[PDB]
């Protein structure tokens, strides 16, 4: 609040304007980064009420209706595990809207595969989508269909191990 200090500071020119402009550029760049990463879909997709995906369990990654934050158990664990003229500007996208974007992406990739990323979301059963992914890596569809229960059990076990590993590693 010193007037004499500000009067002497005016002799140095537009240094303060340069620093404020650089900080403003960084601040808008962070919001641009969040838009580029998370806002890649213009449709907010939702999962069906019946979670019949041919044995595949997505409860650890889908949003929990019981929680007010509408986050997944994995996302909730991630948020719990992360802890003089200065101002902190809030982010343009809040955490619930970012979680909503991730939920839309999860619903699109579960119910429609990769179709929603290239155009309109085309529904496909999840085992058939997994068979398409199996064909992408050079494994025939029959291998997926014959061992569907084993693949679903392995996927559920791996997702549970991911949650345990995140909860158990500092």
């Amino acid at each position: 609040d010193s007037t004499e200090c500000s009067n002497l500071l005016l002799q140095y020119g537009s240094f303060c304007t340069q620093l404020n402009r650089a900080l403003t550029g960084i601040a808008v760049e962070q919001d641009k980064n969040t838009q580029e990463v998370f806002a890649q879909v213009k449709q907010i997709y939702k999962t069906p009420p019946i979670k019949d995906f041919g044995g595949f369990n997505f409860s650890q990654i889908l949003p929990d209706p019981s929680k007010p934050s509408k986050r997944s158990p994995i996302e909730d664990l991630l948020f719990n595990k992360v802890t003089n003229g200065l101002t902190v500007l809030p982010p343009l996208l809040t955490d619930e809207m970012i979680a909503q974007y991730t939920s839309a992406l999860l619903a699109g990739t579960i119910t429609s595969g990769w179709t929603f990323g290239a155009g309109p979301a085309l529904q496909i059963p999840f085992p058939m989508q997994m068979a398409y992914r199996f064909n992408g890596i050079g494994v025939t569809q029959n291998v997926l269909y014959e061992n569907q229960k084993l693949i679903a059990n392995q996927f559920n076990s791996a997702i549970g191990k991911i949650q345990d590993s995140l909860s158990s590693t500092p």
Binding site: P48, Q100, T111, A121, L122, I124
Partner: protein, 50 residues
């Protein structure tokens, strides 16, 4: 206002139904990428002292 993230779309998922496209659109989109800047040189002695 509070922003709207996107238009709501509920995909009609069921265990035995698929959606197959019957037509297509040839879409051309623009992507602008900067490559170079203006090449500037400053004579340090002339700038500071003339």
């Amino acid at each position: 206002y509070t922003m709207s993230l996107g238009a709501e779309n509920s995909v009609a998922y069921s265990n035995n139904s698929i959606a197959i496209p019957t037509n297509f659109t040839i879409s051309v989109t623009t992507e602008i990428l900067p490559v170079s800047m203006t090449k500037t040189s400053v004579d340090c002695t002339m700038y500071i002292c003339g």
